[PDB]
């Protein structure tokens, strides 16, 4: 079959709420910015801007990048850290490591939201599940994960996606400051008072926070025994955790973490998938976790 026929099959699978349309097919991201039908709340918390979390309620449009959702340090001349596009071109050359999604697509009836980390902190979105429209499925991608942390979570009729980390090669940041920024964004988006946290905030803190304040969550993250704050040593029944990097799996391997939101049979399906890709000739899936919300 040709690219168009396969891509329409892909759309019909996605539109039935089938997460496996994204299973094994590698990472995807794009810098492209086209307005999609869905409005969501967006928030940014960054060490360079101490104080209130920045919040955006208006739709993402094509009429200029909001600097809170942009990183001048990405690429040769900057790149958005939060953008929306439609699925006729799923991955572009900005997607480090992309494979299948450079060739095939999800058609222009799919709406894609890319959420990256902030230069020194977290970006997040909150989606009202009852606003996902029939035959207009939505995909959230976090791009190529090489040390950052991605949270997907549900509370009531709302879904949250938060990506925290840094682009500045900072020692120890993501498992401490990155967690604090993610908690600030999650709290702002969910209208919760930012908790009085311990002086030491790390990935275990993130598990505890999500468990106590969200119905269900998935954390996809990097950890290593040489970096204790990165290691998760507690467990909570409503928080799944996926260490896409470990003591063995590191760069040039990479993680992926995606969600589909699909209105079908009068209900919004929400399904997430995290993978770890590593060299076998070929990048292979080393580990995977699929969680429904
Ligand atoms: Mg990072």
Tab-separated table of C-alpha atoms and ligand atoms in Angstrom:
chain	number	residue	atom	x	y	z
A	1	UNK	CA	0.000	0.000	0.000
A	2	UNK	CA	1.047	3.604	-0.519
A	3	UNK	CA	1.629	6.283	2.101
A	4	UNK	CA	-1.879	7.715	1.785
A	5	UNK	CA	-3.614	4.341	2.202
A	6	UNK	CA	-1.491	3.382	5.213
A	7	UNK	CA	-1.997	6.814	6.761
A	8	UNK	CA	-5.788	6.525	6.435
A	9	UNK	CA	-5.603	3.096	8.077
A	10	UNK	CA	-3.562	4.777	10.830
A	11	UNK	CA	-6.236	7.443	11.253
A	12	UNK	CA	-9.019	4.866	11.497
A	13	UNK	CA	-7.057	2.921	14.135
A	14	UNK	CA	-6.356	6.081	16.140
A	15	UNK	CA	-9.979	7.190	15.780
A	16	UNK	CA	-11.124	3.900	17.321
A	17	UNK	CA	-9.033	4.620	20.415
A	18	UNK	CA	-6.312	2.102	19.580
A	19	UNK	CA	-3.024	3.132	21.244
A	20	UNK	CA	-1.139	0.483	19.294
A	21	UNK	CA	-1.141	2.736	16.230
A	22	UNK	CA	1.744	4.447	18.090
A	23	UNK	CA	3.453	1.296	19.427
A	24	UNK	CA	6.999	0.584	18.195
A	25	UNK	CA	6.922	3.264	15.483
A	26	UNK	CA	9.511	5.493	17.166
A	27	UNK	CA	9.506	9.064	18.322
A	28	UNK	CA	7.730	11.967	16.711
A	29	UNK	CA	7.695	15.740	17.072
A	30	UNK	CA	7.436	18.745	14.784
A	31	UNK	CA	8.177	22.426	15.111
A	32	UNK	CA	5.210	23.205	12.849
A	33	UNK	CA	2.528	25.393	14.444
A	34	UNK	CA	-1.046	25.177	13.060
A	35	UNK	CA	-4.104	26.072	15.142
A	36	UNK	CA	-6.138	23.023	16.185
A	37	UNK	CA	-9.777	22.875	17.243
A	38	UNK	CA	-9.098	22.157	20.911
A	39	UNK	CA	-8.513	24.899	23.489
A	40	UNK	CA	-6.555	23.950	26.613
A	41	UNK	CA	-5.030	25.692	29.603
A	42	UNK	CA	-1.224	25.980	29.384
A	43	UNK	CA	1.316	26.861	32.039
A	44	UNK	CA	5.059	27.483	32.315
A	45	UNK	CA	7.325	27.573	35.371
A	46	UNK	CA	11.004	28.341	34.824
A	47	UNK	CA	13.913	29.140	37.149
A	48	UNK	CA	14.639	32.273	35.102
A	49	UNK	CA	11.207	33.654	36.098
A	50	UNK	CA	10.787	33.048	39.831
A	51	UNK	CA	7.330	33.857	41.174
A	52	UNK	CA	3.906	33.056	39.778
A	53	UNK	CA	3.501	30.330	37.194
A	54	UNK	CA	2.735	31.805	33.779
A	55	UNK	CA	-0.698	30.778	32.544
A	56	UNK	CA	-2.194	30.929	29.037
A	57	UNK	CA	-5.881	30.172	28.429
A	58	UNK	CA	-6.249	31.378	24.834
A	59	UNK	CA	-5.778	28.951	21.957
A	60	UNK	CA	-2.362	28.439	20.400
A	61	UNK	CA	-2.382	30.269	17.075
A	62	UNK	CA	0.021	30.685	14.171
A	63	UNK	CA	0.410	34.457	14.656
A	64	UNK	CA	3.558	34.404	16.772
A	65	UNK	CA	5.306	32.435	19.481
A	66	UNK	CA	4.768	33.226	23.174
A	67	UNK	CA	8.285	33.446	24.621
A	68	UNK	CA	7.200	31.501	27.726
A	69	UNK	CA	6.605	28.572	25.332
A	70	UNK	CA	9.774	29.061	23.280
A	71	UNK	CA	13.458	28.269	23.717
A	72	UNK	CA	15.942	30.385	21.784
A	73	UNK	CA	18.605	27.770	22.545
A	74	UNK	CA	17.011	24.921	20.585
A	75	UNK	CA	18.188	24.494	17.027
A	76	UNK	CA	20.146	27.081	15.127
A	77	UNK	CA	17.570	29.833	15.719
A	78	UNK	CA	15.187	28.676	18.447
A	79	UNK	CA	12.119	26.480	18.595
A	80	UNK	CA	8.734	26.354	20.330
A	81	UNK	CA	8.488	24.289	23.486
A	82	UNK	CA	4.691	23.922	23.148
A	83	UNK	CA	3.020	23.798	19.751
A	84	UNK	CA	0.057	22.284	17.944
A	85	UNK	CA	-0.100	20.910	14.406
A	86	UNK	CA	-2.220	18.556	12.327
A	87	UNK	CA	-1.303	14.998	11.502
A	88	UNK	CA	-0.578	15.121	7.767
A	89	UNK	CA	3.135	15.374	8.733
A	90	UNK	CA	3.717	13.634	12.066
A	91	UNK	CA	7.514	14.016	12.489
A	92	UNK	CA	9.958	16.432	10.910
A	93	UNK	CA	13.712	16.792	11.045
A	94	UNK	CA	13.448	18.357	14.527
A	95	UNK	CA	12.496	14.914	15.865
A	96	UNK	CA	15.844	13.418	16.814
A	97	UNK	CA	15.673	9.707	16.124
A	98	UNK	CA	12.394	9.625	14.210
A	99	UNK	CA	11.766	6.704	11.843
A	100	UNK	CA	8.273	5.552	10.782
A	101	UNK	CA	6.619	8.940	11.327
A	102	UNK	CA	8.905	10.635	8.823
A	103	UNK	CA	7.339	8.435	6.139
A	104	UNK	CA	3.732	7.786	7.213
A	105	UNK	CA	1.195	10.055	8.872
A	106	UNK	CA	-2.119	10.269	10.758
A	107	UNK	CA	-3.893	12.540	8.205
A	108	UNK	CA	-4.874	16.178	8.657
A	109	UNK	CA	-7.905	15.131	10.753
A	110	UNK	CA	-5.563	14.278	13.659
A	111	UNK	CA	-4.561	17.107	15.991
A	112	UNK	CA	-1.151	16.869	17.679
A	113	UNK	CA	0.112	18.777	20.725
A	114	UNK	CA	3.856	18.766	21.369
A	115	UNK	CA	4.853	19.573	24.961
A	116	UNK	CA	8.553	20.019	25.707
A	117	UNK	CA	10.359	21.063	28.855
A	118	UNK	CA	11.148	24.725	29.544
A	119	UNK	CA	14.748	25.898	29.271
A	120	UNK	CA	14.960	25.586	33.054
A	121	UNK	CA	11.666	24.042	34.129
A	122	UNK	CA	8.254	22.765	33.190
A	123	UNK	CA	5.485	23.269	30.648
A	124	UNK	CA	2.048	21.757	31.131
A	125	UNK	CA	-1.419	21.602	29.660
A	126	UNK	CA	-4.870	20.758	31.054
A	127	UNK	CA	-7.542	19.401	28.706
A	128	UNK	CA	-11.260	19.114	29.437
A	129	UNK	CA	-12.033	15.567	28.338
A	130	UNK	CA	-15.605	16.505	27.415
A	131	UNK	CA	-14.216	18.912	24.775
A	132	UNK	CA	-12.598	16.168	22.684
A	133	UNK	CA	-14.785	15.916	19.569
A	134	UNK	CA	-15.902	12.875	17.620
A	135	UNK	CA	-13.739	12.110	14.575
A	136	UNK	CA	-11.184	14.697	15.798
A	137	UNK	CA	-8.721	12.619	17.818
A	138	UNK	CA	-5.909	14.336	19.730
A	139	UNK	CA	-2.363	13.069	20.252
A	140	UNK	CA	0.057	14.496	22.829
A	141	UNK	CA	3.746	13.886	22.174
A	142	UNK	CA	6.708	14.741	24.380
A	143	UNK	CA	9.344	14.267	21.669
A	144	UNK	CA	12.688	12.617	22.279
A	145	UNK	CA	13.426	12.027	25.972
A	146	UNK	CA	17.117	12.173	26.915
A	147	UNK	CA	16.913	12.992	30.633
A	148	UNK	CA	13.716	14.977	31.165
A	149	UNK	CA	10.562	13.884	32.999
A	150	UNK	CA	7.070	13.573	31.525
A	151	UNK	CA	3.931	13.361	33.677
A	152	UNK	CA	0.513	12.336	32.402
A	153	UNK	CA	-2.296	12.497	34.937
A	154	UNK	CA	-6.050	12.569	35.308
A	155	UNK	CA	-8.169	14.324	37.925
A	156	UNK	CA	-11.920	14.157	37.449
A	157	UNK	CA	-12.880	15.150	33.915
A	158	UNK	CA	-9.516	16.765	33.143
A	159	UNK	CA	-6.268	15.413	31.743
A	160	UNK	CA	-2.840	16.885	32.446
A	161	UNK	CA	0.463	16.588	30.585
A	162	UNK	CA	3.585	18.166	32.118
A	163	UNK	CA	7.154	18.005	30.806
A	164	UNK	CA	9.990	19.205	33.027
A	165	UNK	CA	13.744	19.370	32.667
A	166	UNK	CA	16.286	21.758	31.222
A	167	UNK	CA	18.076	22.537	27.967
A	168	UNK	CA	21.137	24.043	29.687
A	169	UNK	CA	23.098	20.902	30.640
A	170	UNK	CA	22.513	21.624	34.332
A	171	UNK	CA	23.950	19.211	36.923
A	172	UNK	CA	21.287	17.627	39.158
A	173	UNK	CA	18.486	20.030	38.097
A	174	UNK	CA	15.823	17.785	36.670
A	175	UNK	CA	15.410	15.502	39.695
A	176	UNK	CA	15.191	18.473	42.124
A	177	UNK	CA	14.340	21.862	40.602
A	178	UNK	CA	12.656	20.114	37.710
A	179	UNK	CA	10.328	18.345	40.154
A	180	UNK	CA	9.553	21.602	41.968
A	181	UNK	CA	8.672	23.297	38.675
A	182	UNK	CA	6.474	20.368	37.618
A	183	UNK	CA	4.638	20.519	40.964
A	184	UNK	CA	4.159	24.277	40.533
A	185	UNK	CA	2.665	23.737	37.064
A	186	UNK	CA	0.482	20.802	38.182
A	187	UNK	CA	-0.761	22.811	41.158
A	188	UNK	CA	-1.541	25.885	39.056
A	189	UNK	CA	-3.348	23.867	36.387
A	190	UNK	CA	-5.428	21.967	38.962
A	191	UNK	CA	-6.097	25.044	41.182
A	192	UNK	CA	-4.389	23.429	44.199
A	193	UNK	CA	-2.332	25.453	46.663
A	194	UNK	CA	1.294	24.585	45.986
A	195	UNK	CA	2.016	22.266	48.928
A	196	UNK	CA	4.345	23.207	51.744
A	197	UNK	CA	7.022	20.884	50.470
A	198	UNK	CA	10.060	19.477	52.254
A	199	UNK	CA	13.283	21.383	51.731
A	200	UNK	CA	14.538	18.446	49.633
A	201	UNK	CA	12.306	17.840	46.613
A	202	UNK	CA	13.094	14.894	44.344
A	203	UNK	CA	11.433	12.219	42.200
A	204	UNK	CA	9.972	10.445	45.237
A	205	UNK	CA	8.309	13.757	46.094
A	206	UNK	CA	6.742	13.785	42.646
A	207	UNK	CA	5.237	10.308	43.194
A	208	UNK	CA	3.820	11.346	46.569
A	209	UNK	CA	2.425	14.606	45.223
A	210	UNK	CA	0.731	12.975	42.234
A	211	UNK	CA	-0.637	10.115	44.332
A	212	UNK	CA	-2.175	12.442	46.903
A	213	UNK	CA	-3.558	15.059	44.512
A	214	UNK	CA	-4.485	13.301	41.231
A	215	UNK	CA	-6.711	10.334	40.511
A	216	UNK	CA	-4.081	8.498	38.456
A	217	UNK	CA	-0.712	9.330	36.927
A	218	UNK	CA	2.247	8.091	34.896
A	219	UNK	CA	5.791	9.417	35.371
A	220	UNK	CA	8.372	8.692	32.658
A	221	UNK	CA	11.839	9.663	33.806
A	222	UNK	CA	15.588	9.015	33.819
A	223	UNK	CA	17.321	7.503	36.809
A	224	UNK	CA	20.693	6.186	37.844
A	225	UNK	CA	22.128	4.866	41.095
A	226	UNK	CA	24.881	7.492	40.814
A	227	UNK	CA	22.193	10.207	41.202
A	228	UNK	CA	20.101	9.365	44.284
A	229	UNK	CA	17.524	12.145	43.836
A	230	UNK	CA	16.617	10.610	40.477
A	231	UNK	CA	15.802	7.171	41.901
A	232	UNK	CA	12.211	6.306	42.824
A	233	UNK	CA	12.144	3.973	45.845
A	234	UNK	CA	8.511	4.345	46.929
A	235	UNK	CA	5.387	3.133	45.172
A	236	UNK	CA	1.779	4.309	45.158
A	237	UNK	CA	-1.109	2.354	43.705
A	238	UNK	CA	-2.357	5.213	41.521
A	239	UNK	CA	1.055	6.242	40.088
A	240	UNK	CA	2.822	4.240	37.424
A	241	UNK	CA	6.511	4.920	36.843
A	242	UNK	CA	8.665	4.192	33.814
A	243	UNK	CA	12.427	4.723	34.000
A	244	UNK	CA	13.264	4.983	30.295
A	245	UNK	CA	16.920	5.488	31.235
A	246	UNK	CA	18.542	3.321	33.920
A	247	UNK	CA	22.036	2.403	35.095
A	248	UNK	CA	22.337	0.451	31.821
A	249	UNK	CA	20.201	2.482	29.386
A	250	UNK	CA	21.502	5.978	28.640
A	251	UNK	CA	22.269	8.216	25.686
A	252	UNK	CA	22.285	7.514	22.758
A	253	UNK	CA	19.184	5.486	23.686
A	254	UNK	CA	16.073	7.575	24.248
A	255	UNK	CA	12.568	7.560	25.652
A	256	UNK	CA	9.171	8.471	24.238
A	257	UNK	CA	5.901	9.246	26.008
A	258	UNK	CA	2.596	9.889	24.221
A	259	UNK	CA	-1.142	10.027	24.919
A	260	UNK	CA	-4.206	9.668	22.677
A	261	UNK	CA	-7.535	11.300	23.564
A	262	UNK	CA	-10.393	9.987	21.430
A	263	UNK	CA	-14.153	10.592	21.616
A	264	UNK	CA	-15.869	7.453	20.453
A	265	UNK	CA	-19.150	5.858	21.440
A	266	UNK	CA	-20.104	8.958	23.461
A	267	UNK	CA	-17.091	8.750	25.809
A	268	UNK	CA	-13.540	10.116	25.818
A	269	UNK	CA	-10.856	7.406	25.816
A	270	UNK	CA	-7.457	8.447	27.178
A	271	UNK	CA	-4.513	6.089	26.688
A	272	UNK	CA	-0.806	6.656	27.278
A	273	UNK	CA	2.289	4.796	26.109
A	274	UNK	CA	5.934	5.196	27.138
A	275	UNK	CA	8.800	3.389	25.411
A	276	UNK	CA	12.574	3.134	25.652
A	277	UNK	CA	14.486	2.733	22.369
A	278	UNK	CA	18.037	1.367	22.353
A	279	UNK	CA	20.545	0.082	19.831
A	280	UNK	CA	20.295	-3.652	19.162
A	281	UNK	CA	21.727	-1.845	12.943
A	282	UNK	CA	18.402	-0.908	14.418
A	283	UNK	CA	16.876	0.903	17.356
A	284	UNK	CA	14.709	-1.643	19.226
A	285	UNK	CA	12.106	-1.194	21.940
A	286	UNK	CA	13.888	-2.178	25.128
A	287	UNK	CA	11.004	-1.541	27.541
A	288	UNK	CA	7.455	-0.180	27.400
A	289	UNK	CA	4.540	0.749	29.679
A	290	UNK	CA	0.964	1.360	28.482
A	291	UNK	CA	-1.509	2.956	30.907
A	292	UNK	CA	-5.152	3.876	30.379
A	293	UNK	CA	-6.772	6.812	32.152
B	1	LIG	MG1	16.167	17.367	31.231
